[PDB]
Ligand SMILES: CCNC(=O)c1cc2c(-c3cc(C(C)(C)O)ccc3Oc3c(C)cc(F)cc3C)cn(C)c(=O)c2[nH]1
């Protein structure tokens with residue numbers, strides 16, 4: 001499905017987030033083996049990353065805007081829940097999530 | 111602060127839907143860390159936020175733009191995810207409310223007026 005809302009999420013929201021200096025830890029799934037995090041997939045049951053969201057927008061996976069917005073939300077929430085409050089990654093996620101919300105405030109109404 | 115079409119939608123549509131939700135009660139007022147016996151709360155959460163504060167701010171025309179009110183809702187949810195354990199029920203309550211917040215925000219009027 002291709003709606004004006006999903007087009008905006010792809011061309012405005014994803015475009016702004018993908019290129020952000022803090023985006024690199026979120027562009028691909030968390031490689032728990034490489035990172036040495038054996039409890040990752042035990043705590044995070046729904047892993048999500050921008051690369052998966054990007055691939056989904058490119059292959060018209062979503063039916064509604066709300067579904068893509070929930071995937072961005074899952075990615076940020078996974079980060080806050082798994083990591084320690086003082087981890088830099090939490091600050092990086094918060095910075096990107098603020099941009100996500102600022103952009104979503106201007107999204108088409110459908 | 112001013113009265114925009116988007117700020118009106120956040121008050122009459124978004125806040126209206128969230129305030130009355132069965133899972134809203136722990137979010138209607140600030141986290142009472144003294145009553146809860148949580149001495150580390152204000153050490154980890156430096157920007158406390160709750161729906162009651164957001165509601166009072168919408169009622170008193172505190173915000174200049176919808177994006178500012180949306181950031182306060184986001185701070186409230188993020189504070190919950192960061193402070194609590196992954197398995198705490200409060201995290202599930204916050205996630206349920208945040209999904210409604212995002213569903214409602216998707217239907218907000220696109221352009222901000224006055
Ligand atoms: C409880 C401890 N948690 C972690 O260690 C942890 C690490 C990570 C990473 C992450 C992913 C990658 C690649 C590109 C391989 O994907 C690379 C580095 C990453 O993190 C670091 C960052 C951002 C800066 C550093 F100086 C060092 C590291 C390790 C992503 N996400 C979303 C996480 O939630 C997460 N948690």
Ligand SMILES: CCNC(=O)c1cc2c(-c3cc(C(C)(C)O)ccc3Oc3c(C)cc(F)cc3C)cn(C)c(=O)c2[nH]1
Pocket residue numbers: 135136137139140141142143145146148189190193194195198200
């Ligand atoms: C790591 C430990 N974390 C907590 O203890 C914790 C408690 C809380 C509360 C919260 C606030 C209040 C009042 C009105 C007094 O403020 C009352 C109960 C609350 O929680 C409970 C709920 C929802 C159901 C229960 F069966 C029991 C409790 C305690 C709110 N928020 C947003 C939190 O993030 C939070 N974390």
